[PDB]
Subunit: 237 residues, 6 copies
């Protein structure tokens, strides 16, 4: 057990899908995994382990923000033998050509957090995904007929940012999505020698207020999860 995960070595697979919302974790388990067992309830951060076409897979919430997800991802790498983390989340878009419900794959993750500076002697750590995991995700998306853009995310510490102008800077430098975790997860993976990827669906445009249905959200969310799970099977080869 660790302070935030009441479980032992072997309860988690070597690969873990992590939505922000732990309710979405329970939904992943019942919708995609066979023979699923609950492996964590500490703080209501529900975690499960089952199989997807024979492959052992886990899914657990990480919570909003770099500090929350850094706790869970670290404990998984160092205490539960986890080799790969796939964040499966939502993000807001700043580019007019990036559309609602697009799948975005974060090869890199910008941030305004200080966590990587603390790690990297106050220099610029390029918070990057594992390259094979990125390609695996792109190829799985192609096989599912989903076109996916690959590029930079921005991991914000403040959802309610007092710096509105920063969104224009993000746009100028090609940021595909604004979320709150990738740069933290990528930092942890590098620190403790594991691999990570963040995939997000665009749920918001910080531009116009445009609408989606609940049905449209479920279908797009299911597509991201399919992408992530099929990406794992490609990574196994």
């Amino acid at each position: 057990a660790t302070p935030h995960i009441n479980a032992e070595m072997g309860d988690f697979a070597d690969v873990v899908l992590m939505p922000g919302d732990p309710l979405r974790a329970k939904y992943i388990a019942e919708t995609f995994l066979e023979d699923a067992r609950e492996v964590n309830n500490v703080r209501g951060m529900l975690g499960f382990t089952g199989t997807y076409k024979g492959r052992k897979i886990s899914v657990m919430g990480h919570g909003m923000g770099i500090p929350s997800c850094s706790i869970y991802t670290k404990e998984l790498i160092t205490d539960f033998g986890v080799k790969k983390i796939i964040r499966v989340g939502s993000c807001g878009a700043v580019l007019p050509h990036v559309k609602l419900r697009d799948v975005v794959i974060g090869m890199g993750a910008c941030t305004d957090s200080k966590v990587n500076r603390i790690r990297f002697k106050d220099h610029d750590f390029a918070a990057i995904a594992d390259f094979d995991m990125v390609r695996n995700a792109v190829d799985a998306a192609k096989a599912l007929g989903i076109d996916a853009r690959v590029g930079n995310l921005f991991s914000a510490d403040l959802f309610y940012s007092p710096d509105g102008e920063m969104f224009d800077v993000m746009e100028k430098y090609g940021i595909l999505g604004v979320e709150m975790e990738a740069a933290g997860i990528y930092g942890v993976a590098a620190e403790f020698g594991a691999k990570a990827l963040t995939i997000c669906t665009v749920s918001d445009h910080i531009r116009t207020h445009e609408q989606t249905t609940a049905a449209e959200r479920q279908t797009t969310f299911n597509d991201m999860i399919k992408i992530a799970l099929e990406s794992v099977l490609l990574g196994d080869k």
Copy 2:
């Protein structure tokens, strides 16, 4: 409704107790509040509103880390008329004379987050509690026979810090407890014109590994909550 709180103006009291763990929120509601109703379930971040000796009070989890609690505290101040936030949490100690299960009141909160620098043109914002709320909490503790130390907390972004030496610096400058939120909450309160306090119990010494029972944890936790609730009644006068 707000993106993280499915509720309307009036569902929350003007004062909100916030543990990190949403399971502890449900426990506060059933143990201390009368006539309690559920007011939030979004992302399993359970929130309740009831009364404590006639006084309308709310309790809801905020999640681990500055970014999580900044979401909820902001939305409460700006969309639900919340005037006071009391964080009710745990912390780790670095001072040998600060003992396990001590009640610590954060008049101020140091941090290694960058959130207040983003707010404060990269200068030093002294993240402080509302003074009356601090005194209210000290006086409530005295009336309950609990001695409480008042001073600085340290709100860490990394629970698993790669900078071990920083704990000695904290100790040298008198930091009473290490937690992950106060400086973020104090920042939000100042930004949006409300009041905040963080009270923590010492659950850990980053020094020796010393033990407590589950019974000892419940009693100390109940004492912190009593302190916080009685502090509100003193603040009403």
Copy 3:
């Protein structure tokens, strides 16, 4: 003696009031202290020791700015046995509802100096007063019928700042007064294990640009000093 104080152990009381202006220290001593003898003249930084209602009290100037007051407060603490320092100064106001001749108590002090960053591994140290001294000061003010505002000061390095935009930011985040020392003194008090408090009167509105009459302002200055002296008597119990 120390490099800036030609005096000996015992020559100061264990509490020292500190205006910025040494001529103001002489003013405090002659007006409020009995049997007052001068105990320092090095660099014209006049220090005095006498009694207030039978309690031994010292008063001494600290000069303008964090670097000047850091020198004096340090030497008093480590070489002259001083346990409490009460800065008694002036500040400019930034909030419209903060009026001329309001008494302001700095529970915290923001700053643009980097002294506390030097001390605190480049993180945010929340420069705070000792809580008991704050409370003693508030109660002493209550007993004299004076309505003390407790909150954040801002300790500036540049009285003539090139960046006028920073005053709006101070206003936004609730800064009660702008002065030049508090954050420095609080850093010293935490570094060397003593206690400190800054009281200020508002002598300036960096908003409306106005006065106020000489007799009324000098009355309020005397009230601040009475609050300081009476607060130490409350601290003795």
Copy 4:
């Protein structure tokens, strides 16, 4: 012409390979290009344009360091219609299992420069390559039987760094190679809307301090260049 390139629109291909050494650009041109004409000599920064298997390709030196290569890459992008830049350089190795003559592809590039902080409001910009170009390069290397490592480079300002401790930190966080340009080039490519990639061969071990034979090292250098040229042919489809 631009201030550092005496040539005209059309004189360069829409892809430019860029070694640091202009004499190396002449080497690339004569060895791998047919019908190669020199298109720039200003400051001795030799640029050439020819064909590789019927595809128009240019090659030109960029000089040592982020500031030098930022100038050339910018001018190519905004004035000579260049859409892709492939840096083909050398790096020093930091990881023990990264060997001499390994081909390294910088999906990302860390840095100690502050150029990207100037661009990105002092936050962390993740300096990344274009994903497709990375994949093209990996596939081209696979087709030639070469085992390319994909990950982080570190773009240093000081070849002779005063801070030897930073090399351990690079090792800890998985940096594959240390060079002087990639982060600069990736910043330019994002600023001005083009695409970039850095390939390096490991010519140095800042760990074991060793060689390796002249024929074998020049063989591996030629393989890097073949990978670069073949990757652009894959990019055309």
Copy 5:
């Protein structure tokens, strides 16, 4: 009159010698100037104006630290027509071959203050003296047969520095003397369009622990004053 100088345009000469200690200003006026007339006593920061070999010369203390001297030097320049400031102070040595009583001329001044960073968009401003004034000072020193070093000072905010290692770094980079003002005066000079020079006398050695001794303070102090005053005369011609 200005907020810290009770005097009128004309009361000061167009060059002002400024020691930190106002009692040294007094001493200088008495010992070196004819017809010496006190032009300021606000805050005991004594200012004088008299004559040196017929040349109108002023001398006023500036207090300890960048914030103190930045106030006075500014007010002199904007409201009293002062064109040249010459700081005449003391410093601590860090180089072993710089010995006690040596005269150092601050061609530049390093600092750990944030003031120049505030002025210069967080970039490195090279805080420099006026060249002609430096040359004037060197020629006056030669003419009086006094040895004089020219180079960098370091203007510290913390006399009692908690970072002992920093002195090794100053040593490494050739710092002739540690004082508390020059970098601020040179910043003010540039900001407000005047000229300045800091000359210092090496009091103690930061390493060795021994301060200015017997009558040797006075002659060495007088040598600096002589240089400064003679340097003004050369500047006129």
Copy 6:
């Protein structure tokens, strides 16, 4: 030999003039030196050694930017007994009263590079030239009847700067010329225990948009070289 200079101890004189352009080094060797002998061609960074009025003098390009010139200047100092570096370059003007073809002497150099911050524990290092060398240069300029300004340069990392406002700040603070090297050369000089000076010729105006024109480049360029060379002679005597 060093990694970027293929030559032996003795091949270089103890002072080296360095333009950015290696073809200017060639031109200088041809036009000003007798018995001129090429001592380096590694990376086309041409180095020469000959005679000026019997004095052994070397001249070598350093490439564009702090990182490029930091490599060469270091290697010259540590492995070829070079005592003095004189950068002889071009700069852009920011002050309207600084006109095209003006000769500027870099007494100090501001910068937006992080290199000196890396060397100086993130504090402000005042990057200065050697005083005697500055004086030598001014006296040689007077003797040749050439006007010469003495003050601060600004060493930029981005020729194509995305921060246009910064030029206003340079203007405000008296920056005589914008170039890309001086602050790095002065840092290297201090780090490795040699002396340096940067002299520049004002090519364009950053505001006005017009570069060095017709034969006036050559005479103005030759005036700088003449000053530099004559300045060496004065330094010997």
